[PDB]
Amino acid sequence: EIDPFEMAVKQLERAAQYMDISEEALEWLKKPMRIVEVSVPIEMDDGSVKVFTGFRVQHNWARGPTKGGIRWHPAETLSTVKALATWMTWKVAVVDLPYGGGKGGIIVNPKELSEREQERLARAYIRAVYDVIGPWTDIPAPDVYTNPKIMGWMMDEYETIMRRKGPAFGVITGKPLSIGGSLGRGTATAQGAIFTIREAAKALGIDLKGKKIAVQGYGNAGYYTAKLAKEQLGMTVVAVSDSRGGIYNPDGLDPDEVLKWKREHGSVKDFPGATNITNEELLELEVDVLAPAAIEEVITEKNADNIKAKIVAEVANGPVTPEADDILREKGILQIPDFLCNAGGVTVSYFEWVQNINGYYWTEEEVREKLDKKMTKAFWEVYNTHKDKNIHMRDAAYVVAVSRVYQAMKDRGWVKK
Amino acid sequence: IDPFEMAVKQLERAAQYMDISEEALEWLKKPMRIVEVSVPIEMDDGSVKVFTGFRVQHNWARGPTKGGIRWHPAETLSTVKALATWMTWKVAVVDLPYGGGKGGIIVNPKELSEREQERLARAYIRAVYDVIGPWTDIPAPDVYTNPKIMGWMMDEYETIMRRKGPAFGVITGKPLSIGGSLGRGTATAQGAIFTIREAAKALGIDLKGKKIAVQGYGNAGYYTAKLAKEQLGMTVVAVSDSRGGIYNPDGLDPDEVLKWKREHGSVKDFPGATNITNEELLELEVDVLAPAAIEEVITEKNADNIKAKIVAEVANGPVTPEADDILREKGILQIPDFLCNAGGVTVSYFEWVQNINGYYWTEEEVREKLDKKMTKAFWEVYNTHKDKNIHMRDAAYVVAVSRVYQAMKDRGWVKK
Amino acid sequence: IDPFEMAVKQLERAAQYMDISEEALEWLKKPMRIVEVSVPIEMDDGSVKVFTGFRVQHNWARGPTKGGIRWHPAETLSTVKALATWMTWKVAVVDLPYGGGKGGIIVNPKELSEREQERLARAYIRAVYDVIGPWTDIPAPDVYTNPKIMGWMMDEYETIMRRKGPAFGVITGKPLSIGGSLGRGTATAQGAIFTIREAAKALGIDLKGKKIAVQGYGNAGYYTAKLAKEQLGMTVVAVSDSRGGIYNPDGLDPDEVLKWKREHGSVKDFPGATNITNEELLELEVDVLAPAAIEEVITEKNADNIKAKIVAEVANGPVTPEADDILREKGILQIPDFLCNAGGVTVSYFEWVQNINGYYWTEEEVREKLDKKMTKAFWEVYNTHKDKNIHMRDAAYVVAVSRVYQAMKDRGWVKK
Amino acid sequence: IDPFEMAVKQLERAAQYMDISEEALEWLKKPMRIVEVSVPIEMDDGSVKVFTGFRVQHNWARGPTKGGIRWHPAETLSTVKALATWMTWKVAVVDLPYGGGKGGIIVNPKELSEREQERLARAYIRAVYDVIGPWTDIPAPDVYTNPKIMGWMMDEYETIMRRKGPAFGVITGKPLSIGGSLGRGTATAQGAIFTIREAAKALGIDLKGKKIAVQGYGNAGYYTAKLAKEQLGMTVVAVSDSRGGIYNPDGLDPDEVLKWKREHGSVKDFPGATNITNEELLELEVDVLAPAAIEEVITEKNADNIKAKIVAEVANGPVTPEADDILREKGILQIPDFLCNAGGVTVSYFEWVQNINGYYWTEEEVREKLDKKMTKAFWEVYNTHKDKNIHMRDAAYVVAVSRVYQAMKDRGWVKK
């Protein structure tokens, strides 16, 4: 229907308040430029042919090829896919990638599918959307219930149809390392987040080394943000959590042994010295850095006045709500907005694509140097925009992103003004 | 949505009269590719506006998808989808090596300048270029689009395609100077005259000196009367415009009637003719009745008063389903609309063949081919109706859906 | 490699009957392109198996190469090459704008499920895509491949090609739904009947009422018998198959004995006949003998016993070269195999023409055209044998090799 | 055939030192694509002559296939196939995003004029055009082909390609004026030197002032001696031609020796040197012995008489498998040929990278990148041999085949 999309358009309209943008250009940006819906037929293991529904949305490619993941999910809608493609346009523009925004999806429950039917689905998706994707057109990537395994299957099929005529590795990212993958992909989101957390404390004078962090969540993001916040920033991880509960212990938790416990015990609860707490105890925890590395709107109106960290680093997307926002800005709390804070992920995927189309692969250290600079410069631009335009960090991020996209459209002559 | 859900329902009905696997049904219910795109133009009043454009390609099992583009303020994706699905049956009933497609732009085009119209034509092609082509998807005129717009569209395609292929063949309905076909104007009527002749044959009637009534005196109606008289030797005893009808049991001459309508604004008072009503024309005792006008004009209410031996549905939809049941039980032979008026989609196929071949046919050549095509389509629908004991309408669908399904099975798309 | 070597040797004999430079001759002895590919499939049991496929394009001076794909466990690159070389002569004797190609996979298709067979067919097209296509190299069915597999292959090609061109025309022998041709299943037999009729004409023989015997009773034998009876007015006095022959001086009904064959496994012990042996069948006093089973059935041992006025070689290689001399001494007109049974490849050409022209022919259209290709091909070869005063078989090769060699010179491939 | 059978068996041996599924083993036993083409040229005679060319692409899982073209009168498809197969483990051991390819023409180039050689280089490209290209299959020089021939080939490609893409990147070993790379000429030696330096590091040997002998004195032997001295600061106590060796416990100067060899044809009687035999050179008590001439120079017969701490296999195939066991049991560290001489293919890579990126590197940049790749490659094969406790040759296959096999699984080519 829409409303994920309604929502995306709304936050674009809101940001048009903090910058001069023509109506022409605003209207153009509210429409995804190409939306494709295709039948994705596979033959089940039992011999029956099922047709699934797939989408690929290319929101805007003024700045270059569109970029974005493919989600396999039974509750997938075109409204979601469009909303997310719109957000991708801003996300890649906030870290100055020469990309537009794109996204895809199949309405499927993948855990009903065997490996073999999953490869069929991955290959049938590519055979269906082939004419609108490509290394210089639209470059997919993993997402919800897709992973490098499926990326490899999709790449191979693309290379088969293309007849090995071009950099087919660069048709898609998140690939296995054996076939065009990139080092640094797993750490990407956390690592970028950590750079922004660093440049934030820098801007704030906060010395950071030894100071406290709490990380709400323990997926890949949460675990690694905790790890690097520690072993890279000198912080004391005094709290983390998982879906079923969190733990505190202000002497210093160890993210690995906490992870062993988590996998050992299903949860970080009960941990060695871990004064078990609630998530909101974690959110209302007095730290230097709080990283809600889990779930949307967890700091809303009904808790925001009790958020204690000097810096809120949104590794998770959408943790802080607009009302939550205003409180925190006026509290004096510096949020690193999600799509700037976790852009390290889309940045390392740009790097993957660059290694592919150039036929030359970087090192673990080269990728991080490069990620460091992107994240650093991106944060600075948003930070100085929010200072100079005296607006909230989030709106600054949108003004940075939408200005790039707007400018590109103008320079092509897409909009005259 | 409603129009699309309607098209889906009509397939599920047709599936009641034939054996089709569930997996093939589920496939035919889903359009295989839908494309929605921004279509930006610069308006004359200086603004840049981005209209929403669609191209739907329902199924290409039999060949490239074929179908018109609508410029219309009420365009929904659901209408474009329904029309693509229906177009798959239309091209299959008359055995064209095509699947079904359709497009439209959501715009009120009524007051767009020629300049804005060309820009919109061109911007549409530039948006959908990657999914169309002489061997992929071949558009055509529809609501608010015409040959003029087809020419601008072709030209833009050729310019992007770099003249590397048969670009004329990317779209039909083109002006004659640039790859258009002869026989396009009279195609609907001429095709109908062939099925009327074949229906008569099926019924054992010789139409020479038999009586025909035609409801409607636009292009379709006028040429149906004119050709029935001319080719089939029939006596045009009634025709009618939107206002009313005229009658003369010794025959109206369709040209004179057209002349009269030109001068007087209506067929009314035509010298020697009895003024009758539309609904009276419908009930005349004639060998052929050709509703060439509005839809649902033969219904549950008047269907039992029809006296025609053959009812040629030249207009789309002129007979409702209750009326179907009645006319059948009365032994009245209906030529269902998408069979009867298929000469249109047939002659648009002919155009493509001419383009793709770089060689153009005469009037006589187009007519002879249209004859063959229409004649075999009638017999196929007729024999299916007899052999299966089903209404002519349901037989037309079983013939269409059977073709597409056979093609799907023969490609390995569905195993079953 | 004896199969290819045998092919080369035959080209070398034909050079003895015409003026052809060493240049050209050395060119024609080599296949211009030979592709050998890994064709992997995931078996039903999840295991992946790599099969070996070949595609061979012998010579494309005259146009794209044409030829079928054998799925057979003793396929060798040498046979494929031999067959490709021979295809070039076959497409040329009957004057197609083609050259010759052939392909094959080393697989026993009888051990693969339909799902595994579709995977194989698709893996083959995925493997050879870059060297085949509608104006490059056009495959077709052969040993253990059929229209079902052609449809699968055409489909995988269309998919990789992104429907940019006439993907129907990449391969012939397709199901009718997706571009196949009428006239296909009886093409070989029908082609032979035309050359039989022209041979009779050359001999001054009126075939109505005259006797024909046919060795072999598969599709070609069956339809050779049936069409000679019905079209030529002949009396079918004997037919046979692997298990034996049957004789009736008064005539056999081809459908009755086909029903008996289907019922009992062989034409043998048909109640409406006496049994005779295959050799006895070969020696009957008939106007036409049509060997339509296996190769080398007429040899040095029995060639003197043949009494047939015309030997129509429906099968490939039924007569040995010793037999050629003998029968030609005896005054027996042979219709050499690759001439006699060329109606198949002629009709496959017709199918490709319909595909690339997006326009399909009627049964009777495919027939008249076949009729003329075959007739014309026959008088060409017959008048060569007459003028150059040589064996029909050598006149056939001269005609073929001359065409291919003229095209090579006209391109400047060879300078003489 | 045999060369190929040898390669298959070397792979079958590899498999026993790692985990590799039978379906993956069988896949890897087979060249995925094999092209055999006619390659015609007009002689300066004016006569047209058709040569036989091959191009084999064994496996492209890791990326485009890389490998050279051989002009040689005893060229066999089995040979091109064996070398293509070997090419795949080479580009893998050194972690290039490539797979293995190889090509060949059966010709005596020595009998070909320069004009005719160009014609042949151009015809080869005209014939294999569809299966090669910057992202498909990138050739290189080999036996009797050189940068001069690459430039002709690249040019013909660029002409057929219509300059649509980075045509420089279709073929490596190019002249510097049209996309060639610096570092090319000394790439194999320079790479041998890095591996030698690292082998030393591994053994705790400082090579400064240690003795090296080098068998063979083409480019590879020459530059190995020259750099071992200049870079590694070794004493070159002996080098050797085909004629024989020369020795001097005090040192030979590689440049002097080459001058001398240039002025005389041979190294024999180099001032101050004692003439020794090649077998005497091999048995020299040195720190590094580099067989940079012919294959199977170290065998069962003489392997026990080898006194080098390091056998750097600069040539391909110098030590036999029996010899491998003897040397290893003796504590001698071999640097297996396809790891040790991989600097050539490593710089052909850097060339292709510069070509597709339209940006060229310096001598210094080429050399440091190579240093890094050859070093990193060495330690991997080294630590494999140590950790699996296997011969360095088998470790190099384990490293290489594991890479090619991991890419196949991640594409889903082989399921296990």
Side-chain angles (χ1 to χ4, degrees), chain B residues 33 57 60-63 65 97 135-136 349 352-353 356-357 361 369 372 406-407 410-413 415, chain C residues 118 122 148 151-152 154-155 158 162-166 168 175-178 355-360 362 365:
Chain B
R33 184 152 58 171
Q57 294 171 15
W60 55 81
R62 301 257 310 158
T65 67
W135 287 96
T136 319
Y349 165 67
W352 172 85
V353 171
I356 267 198
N357 292 176
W361 312 341
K369 261 103 162 188
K372 267 209 197 191
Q406 198 46 49
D410 287 344
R411 292 168 171 262
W413 287 7
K415 327 285 136 176
Chain C
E118 187 180 4
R122 295 184 181 275
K148 171 192 65 171
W152 292 328
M154 183 288 289
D155 184 64
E158 188 184 84
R162 305 323 294 190
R163 303 151 66 191
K164 297 301 196 164
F168 275 14
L176 267 176
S177 54
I178 49 184
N355 296 167
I356 62 135
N357 290 313
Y359 194 82
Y360 298 74
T362 70
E365 284 164 347

Coordinates of all heavy atoms in Angstrom, one line a residue, chain B residues 33 57 60-63 65 97 135-136 349 352-353 356-357 361 369 372 406-407 410-413 415, chain C residues 118 122 148 151-152 154-155 158 162-166 168 175-178 355-360 362 365:
Chain B
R33 N 6.2 -8.9 -15.9 CA 7.0 -7.7 -15.6 C 6.1 -6.5 -15.6 O 5.5 -6.1 -16.6 CB 8.0 -7.6 -16.7 CG 9.0 -6.4 -16.4 CD 10.3 -6.6 -17.1 NE 10.3 -6.8 -18.5 CZ 11.3 -6.8 -19.2 NH1 12.6 -6.7 -18.7 NH2 11.2 -6.9 -20.5
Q57 N 3.9 -6.0 -19.0 CA 4.1 -7.1 -19.9 C 3.6 -8.3 -19.2 O 4.3 -8.8 -18.3 CB 5.6 -7.2 -20.3 CG 6.0 -5.9 -21.1 CD 7.5 -5.9 -21.3 OE1 8.3 -6.8 -21.1 NE2 8.0 -4.7 -21.7
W60 N 4.9 -13.2 -22.2 CA 5.5 -13.3 -23.5 C 5.9 -14.7 -24.0 O 6.8 -14.8 -24.8 CB 6.8 -12.3 -23.5 CG 7.8 -12.6 -22.5 CD1 8.8 -13.6 -22.6 CD2 8.0 -12.0 -21.2 NE1 9.6 -13.6 -21.4 CE2 9.1 -12.6 -20.6 CE3 7.4 -10.9 -20.6 CZ2 9.6 -12.2 -19.4 CZ3 7.8 -10.5 -19.4 CH2 8.9 -11.1 -18.8
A61 N 5.1 -15.6 -23.5 CA 5.3 -17.0 -23.9 C 5.2 -17.3 -25.4 O 6.0 -18.0 -26.0 CB 4.4 -18.0 -23.2
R62 N 4.3 -16.5 -26.1 CA 4.1 -16.8 -27.5 C 4.9 -15.9 -28.4 O 4.9 -16.1 -29.6 CB 2.6 -16.5 -27.8 CG 1.6 -17.5 -27.0 CD 1.2 -18.6 -27.9 NE 0.7 -18.0 -29.1 CZ 0.6 -18.7 -30.2 NH1 0.9 -20.0 -30.2 NH2 0.2 -18.1 -31.3
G63 N 5.6 -14.9 -27.8 CA 6.2 -13.8 -28.7 C 6.3 -12.5 -27.9 O 6.1 -12.5 -26.7
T65 N 5.5 -9.0 -26.3 CA 4.2 -8.4 -25.9 C 3.8 -7.2 -26.8 O 4.7 -6.7 -27.5 CB 4.2 -8.0 -24.4 OG1 5.2 -6.9 -24.2 CG2 4.6 -9.1 -23.5
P97 N 1.8 -14.3 -33.1 CA 3.0 -14.6 -32.3 C 3.4 -13.6 -31.3 O 4.5 -13.1 -31.4 CB 4.0 -14.8 -33.5 CG 3.6 -13.8 -34.5 CD 2.1 -13.9 -34.5
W135 N 11.3 -6.8 -30.8 CA 11.3 -8.3 -30.5 C 11.1 -8.5 -29.0 O 11.1 -9.6 -28.5 CB 12.5 -9.0 -30.9 CG 12.6 -9.2 -32.4 CD1 13.3 -8.4 -33.3 CD2 11.9 -10.1 -33.2 NE1 12.9 -8.8 -34.6 CE2 12.1 -9.9 -34.5 CE3 11.0 -11.2 -32.8 CZ2 11.5 -10.6 -35.6 CZ3 10.4 -12.0 -33.9 CH2 10.7 -11.7 -35.2
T136 N 10.8 -7.4 -28.3 CA 10.5 -7.5 -26.8 C 9.1 -7.0 -26.5 O 8.3 -7.7 -25.8 CB 11.5 -6.6 -26.0 OG1 12.8 -6.8 -26.6 CG2 11.5 -7.0 -24.6
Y349 N -0.4 -6.2 -35.9 CA 0.6 -7.2 -36.2 C 1.1 -7.2 -37.7 O 2.3 -7.2 -37.9 CB -0.1 -8.6 -35.9 CG 0.6 -9.8 -36.5 CD1 1.9 -10.2 -36.0 CD2 0.1 -10.5 -37.5 CE1 2.6 -11.2 -36.6 CE2 0.7 -11.5 -38.1 CZ 2.0 -11.9 -37.7 OH 2.7 -12.9 -38.3
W352 N 3.8 -4.5 -38.0 CA 5.0 -4.9 -37.5 C 5.8 -5.9 -38.4 O 6.9 -5.6 -38.8 CB 4.7 -5.6 -36.1 CG 5.9 -6.3 -35.5 CD1 6.8 -5.7 -34.7 CD2 6.2 -7.7 -35.4 NE1 7.7 -6.7 -34.2 CE2 7.3 -7.9 -34.6 CE3 5.6 -8.8 -36.1 CZ2 7.8 -9.2 -34.4 CZ3 6.1 -10.1 -35.8 CH2 7.2 -10.2 -35.0
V353 N 5.0 -6.8 -39.0 CA 5.6 -7.8 -40.0 C 6.2 -7.0 -41.2 O 7.4 -7.3 -41.5 CB 4.6 -8.8 -40.5 CG1 5.2 -9.6 -41.7 CG2 4.1 -9.7 -39.4
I356 N 9.5 -5.0 -39.7 CA 10.5 -6.1 -39.5 C 11.0 -6.8 -40.7 O 12.2 -7.1 -40.8 CB 9.9 -7.0 -38.4 CG1 10.3 -6.5 -37.0 CG2 10.1 -8.5 -38.7 CD1 10.2 -7.5 -36.0
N357 N 10.3 -6.7 -41.8 CA 10.7 -7.3 -43.1 C 11.1 -6.2 -44.1 O 11.4 -6.6 -45.3 CB 9.5 -8.0 -43.8 CG 9.0 -9.2 -43.0 OD1 8.0 -9.9 -43.4 ND2 9.8 -9.6 -42.0
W361 N 3.0 -4.1 -47.8 CA 1.9 -4.7 -48.6 C 0.9 -3.7 -49.2 O 0.8 -2.5 -48.7 CB 1.1 -5.7 -47.8 CG 2.0 -6.7 -47.1 CD1 3.3 -7.0 -47.3 CD2 1.6 -7.4 -45.9 NE1 3.7 -7.9 -46.3 CE2 2.7 -8.1 -45.4 CE3 0.4 -7.6 -45.2 CZ2 2.6 -8.9 -44.3 CZ3 0.3 -8.4 -44.1 CH2 1.4 -9.0 -43.6
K369 N -4.8 -11.3 -46.4 CA -4.2 -11.8 -45.2 C -5.1 -11.7 -44.0 O -5.1 -12.6 -43.1 CB -2.9 -11.1 -44.9 CG -1.7 -11.9 -45.3 CD -1.1 -11.3 -46.6 CE 0.3 -11.7 -46.9 NZ 0.9 -10.9 -48.0
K372 N -7.7 -14.6 -44.2 CA -7.2 -15.8 -43.7 C -7.2 -15.8 -42.2 O -7.5 -16.8 -41.6 CB -5.7 -16.0 -44.2 CG -5.5 -16.8 -45.5 CD -4.1 -17.5 -45.4 CE -3.6 -18.0 -46.8 NZ -2.4 -18.9 -46.7
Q406 N -0.1 -23.6 -23.7 CA 0.7 -24.5 -24.6 C 2.1 -24.0 -24.8 O 3.1 -24.7 -24.4 CB 0.1 -24.7 -25.9 CG 0.6 -26.0 -26.7 CD 0.6 -27.2 -25.8 OE1 -0.4 -27.5 -25.1 NE2 1.8 -27.8 -25.7
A407 N 2.2 -22.7 -25.2 CA 3.5 -22.0 -25.2 C 4.3 -22.0 -23.9 O 5.5 -22.5 -23.9 CB 3.3 -20.6 -25.7
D410 N 5.5 -25.6 -23.4 CA 6.5 -26.0 -24.4 C 7.9 -25.3 -24.2 O 8.9 -25.8 -24.6 CB 6.0 -25.7 -25.9 CG 5.0 -26.8 -26.3 OD1 5.0 -27.8 -25.6 OD2 4.2 -26.6 -27.3
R411 N 7.9 -24.2 -23.4 CA 9.2 -23.6 -23.0 C 9.8 -24.2 -21.7 O 10.9 -23.9 -21.3 CB 9.0 -22.1 -22.8 CG 8.7 -21.4 -24.1 CD 8.3 -20.0 -23.7 NE 8.1 -19.0 -24.7 CZ 9.1 -18.1 -24.9 NH1 10.3 -18.1 -24.2 NH2 8.9 -17.2 -25.8
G412 N 9.0 -25.0 -21.0 CA 9.4 -25.5 -19.7 C 9.1 -24.6 -18.6 O 9.5 -24.8 -17.5
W413 N 8.3 -23.5 -18.8 CA 8.0 -22.6 -17.7 C 7.2 -23.2 -16.6 O 7.4 -22.9 -15.4 CB 7.2 -21.4 -18.2 CG 8.0 -20.4 -19.0 CD1 9.3 -20.6 -19.4 CD2 7.5 -19.2 -19.6 NE1 9.6 -19.5 -20.2 CE2 8.6 -18.6 -20.3 CE3 6.3 -18.5 -19.5 CZ2 8.5 -17.4 -21.0 CZ3 6.2 -17.3 -20.2 CH2 7.3 -16.8 -20.9
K415 N 5.7 -27.2 -15.8 CA 5.9 -28.6 -16.2 C 4.7 -29.3 -16.5 O 4.7 -30.4 -17.2 CB 6.6 -29.4 -15.0 CG 7.5 -28.5 -14.1 CD 8.9 -28.2 -14.8 CE 9.3 -26.7 -14.6 NZ 10.6 -26.4 -15.1
Chain C
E118 N 16.1 -31.4 -19.0 CA 15.9 -30.0 -19.3 C 17.1 -29.2 -18.8 O 17.5 -28.2 -19.5 CB 14.6 -29.4 -18.6 CG 14.3 -28.0 -18.9 CD 13.1 -27.4 -18.3 OE1 12.5 -28.2 -17.4 OE2 12.7 -26.3 -18.5
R122 N 19.4 -26.8 -21.2 CA 19.7 -25.5 -20.9 C 21.2 -25.2 -20.6 O 21.7 -24.2 -21.1 CB 18.9 -25.0 -19.7 CG 17.4 -25.0 -20.0 CD 16.6 -24.5 -18.8 NE 15.2 -24.5 -19.0 CZ 14.5 -23.5 -19.7 NH1 15.1 -22.4 -20.1 NH2 13.2 -23.7 -20.0
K148 N 10.5 -31.2 -27.9 CA 10.5 -30.9 -26.5 C 11.8 -30.2 -26.0 O 11.8 -29.2 -25.3 CB 10.2 -32.1 -25.6 CG 10.4 -31.9 -24.2 CD 10.4 -33.2 -23.4 CE 11.6 -34.0 -23.8 NZ 11.8 -35.1 -22.9
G151 N 12.4 -26.7 -27.6 CA 11.7 -25.6 -26.9 C 12.4 -25.2 -25.7 O 12.5 -24.0 -25.4
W152 N 13.0 -26.1 -24.9 CA 13.7 -25.8 -23.7 C 15.0 -25.0 -24.1 O 15.4 -24.1 -23.3 CB 14.2 -27.1 -23.0 CG 13.1 -27.9 -22.4 CD1 11.9 -27.4 -21.8 CD2 13.1 -29.3 -22.0 NE1 11.2 -28.3 -21.2 CE2 11.9 -29.5 -21.3 CE3 14.0 -30.3 -22.3 CZ2 11.6 -30.8 -20.8 CZ3 13.7 -31.6 -21.8 CH2 12.5 -31.8 -21.1
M154 N 15.6 -23.1 -27.0 CA 15.1 -21.8 -27.5 C 14.8 -20.9 -26.3 O 15.3 -19.8 -26.2 CB 13.9 -22.0 -28.4 CG 13.3 -20.7 -29.0 SD 12.4 -19.7 -27.8 CE 10.9 -20.7 -27.5
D155 N 14.2 -21.5 -25.3 CA 13.8 -20.7 -24.1 C 15.0 -20.1 -23.4 O 15.0 -18.9 -23.0 CB 12.9 -21.5 -23.2 CG 12.4 -20.6 -22.0 OD1 11.6 -19.7 -22.4 OD2 12.8 -20.8 -20.9
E158 N 16.6 -17.4 -25.5 CA 15.8 -16.1 -25.4 C 16.1 -15.4 -24.1 O 16.2 -14.2 -24.0 CB 14.3 -16.4 -25.4 CG 13.4 -15.2 -25.5 CD 11.9 -15.4 -25.5 OE1 11.4 -15.5 -24.4 OE2 11.3 -15.4 -26.6
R162 N 18.0 -11.8 -23.8 CA 17.1 -10.7 -23.3 C 16.1 -10.2 -24.4 O 15.8 -9.0 -24.5 CB 18.0 -9.5 -22.9 CG 19.0 -9.9 -21.8 CD 18.4 -10.9 -20.9 NE 17.4 -10.4 -20.0 CZ 16.9 -11.0 -19.0 NH1 17.4 -12.2 -18.6 NH2 16.0 -10.4 -18.2
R163 N 15.6 -11.2 -25.1 CA 14.6 -10.9 -26.1 C 14.9 -9.7 -27.0 O 14.0 -9.1 -27.6 CB 13.2 -10.7 -25.5 CG 12.7 -11.8 -24.5 CD 11.8 -11.2 -23.5 NE 10.6 -10.6 -24.0 CZ 9.8 -9.8 -23.3 NH1 10.0 -9.6 -22.0 NH2 8.7 -9.3 -23.8
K164 N 16.2 -9.6 -27.3 CA 16.6 -8.5 -28.3 C 16.4 -8.8 -29.7 O 16.3 -7.9 -30.5 CB 18.1 -8.1 -28.0 CG 18.3 -7.6 -26.7 CD 17.5 -6.3 -26.4 CE 18.0 -5.5 -25.3 NZ 17.5 -4.1 -25.3
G165 N 16.2 -10.1 -30.1 CA 16.0 -10.4 -31.5 C 15.1 -11.6 -31.7 O 14.5 -12.2 -30.8
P166 N 15.0 -12.1 -33.0 CA 14.2 -13.3 -33.2 C 14.8 -14.6 -32.6 O 15.2 -15.5 -33.3 CB 14.2 -13.4 -34.8 CG 15.4 -12.7 -35.2 CD 15.5 -11.6 -34.2
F168 N 13.3 -17.1 -31.6 CA 12.6 -18.3 -32.1 C 13.5 -18.9 -33.2 O 13.7 -20.1 -33.2 CB 11.3 -17.9 -32.8 CG 10.1 -17.9 -31.8 CD1 10.3 -17.9 -30.4 CD2 8.8 -17.8 -32.3 CE1 9.2 -17.8 -29.5 CE2 7.7 -17.7 -31.4 CZ 7.9 -17.7 -30.0
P175 N 8.3 -27.0 -30.9 CA 6.9 -27.1 -30.7 C 6.2 -25.9 -31.5 O 6.8 -24.9 -31.6 CB 6.7 -27.0 -29.2 CG 7.9 -27.6 -28.7 CD 9.0 -27.1 -29.6
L176 N 5.1 -26.2 -32.1 CA 4.3 -25.3 -32.9 C 3.9 -24.0 -32.1 O 3.8 -22.9 -32.7 CB 3.1 -25.9 -33.4 CG 3.1 -26.5 -34.8 CD1 1.8 -27.2 -35.1 CD2 3.4 -25.4 -35.8
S177 N 3.7 -24.1 -30.8 CA 3.3 -23.0 -30.0 C 4.4 -21.9 -29.9 O 4.0 -20.7 -29.9 CB 3.1 -23.5 -28.6 OG 4.2 -24.1 -28.1
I178 N 5.6 -22.3 -29.9 CA 6.7 -21.3 -29.8 C 7.5 -21.3 -31.1 O 8.7 -21.4 -31.1 CB 7.6 -21.6 -28.6 CG1 8.0 -23.1 -28.6 CG2 6.8 -21.2 -27.4 CD1 8.8 -23.5 -27.4
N355 N 10.2 -17.8 -38.4 CA 10.8 -17.2 -37.2 C 11.4 -15.8 -37.4 O 10.9 -14.9 -36.8 CB 11.8 -18.1 -36.6 CG 11.2 -19.5 -36.1 OD1 12.0 -20.4 -35.8 ND2 9.9 -19.5 -35.9
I356 N 12.3 -15.7 -38.4 CA 13.0 -14.4 -38.5 C 12.1 -13.4 -39.2 O 12.4 -12.2 -39.1 CB 14.4 -14.5 -39.3 CG1 14.2 -15.0 -40.7 CG2 15.3 -15.4 -38.5 CD1 14.9 -14.3 -41.7
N357 N 11.1 -13.8 -39.9 CA 10.1 -12.9 -40.5 C 8.8 -12.7 -39.7 O 7.9 -12.1 -40.2 CB 9.8 -13.4 -41.9 CG 11.0 -13.2 -42.8 OD1 11.6 -12.2 -42.9 ND2 11.3 -14.3 -43.5
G358 N 8.8 -13.3 -38.5 CA 7.6 -13.2 -37.6 C 6.3 -13.5 -38.3 O 5.3 -13.0 -37.9
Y359 N 6.3 -14.5 -39.2 CA 5.1 -14.7 -40.0 C 5.1 -16.2 -40.4 O 6.0 -16.6 -41.1 CB 5.1 -13.8 -41.2 CG 3.8 -13.7 -41.9 CD1 2.8 -12.9 -41.4 CD2 3.5 -14.6 -43.0 CE1 1.5 -12.9 -42.0 CE2 2.3 -14.6 -43.6 CZ 1.3 -13.8 -43.1 OH 0.0 -13.9 -43.6
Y360 N 4.0 -16.9 -40.1 CA 4.0 -18.3 -40.2 C 3.1 -18.9 -41.3 O 2.1 -18.2 -41.8 CB 3.6 -19.0 -38.9 CG 4.6 -18.7 -37.8 CD1 4.7 -17.4 -37.3 CD2 5.6 -19.6 -37.5 CE1 5.7 -17.1 -36.5 CE2 6.6 -19.2 -36.7 CZ 6.7 -18.0 -36.2 OH 7.7 -17.6 -35.4
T362 N 0.9 -21.7 -43.8 CA 0.0 -22.9 -43.8 C 0.7 -24.2 -44.4 O 1.6 -24.1 -45.2 CB -1.2 -22.6 -44.7 OG1 -0.7 -22.6 -46.1 CG2 -1.8 -21.2 -44.4
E365 N 1.1 -24.1 -47.8 CA 2.2 -23.2 -48.2 C 3.6 -23.9 -48.1 O 4.3 -24.0 -49.0 CB 2.2 -21.9 -47.5 CG 1.1 -21.0 -48.0 CD 0.7 -19.8 -47.0 OE1 1.2 -19.9 -45.8 OE2 0.1 -18.9 -47.5

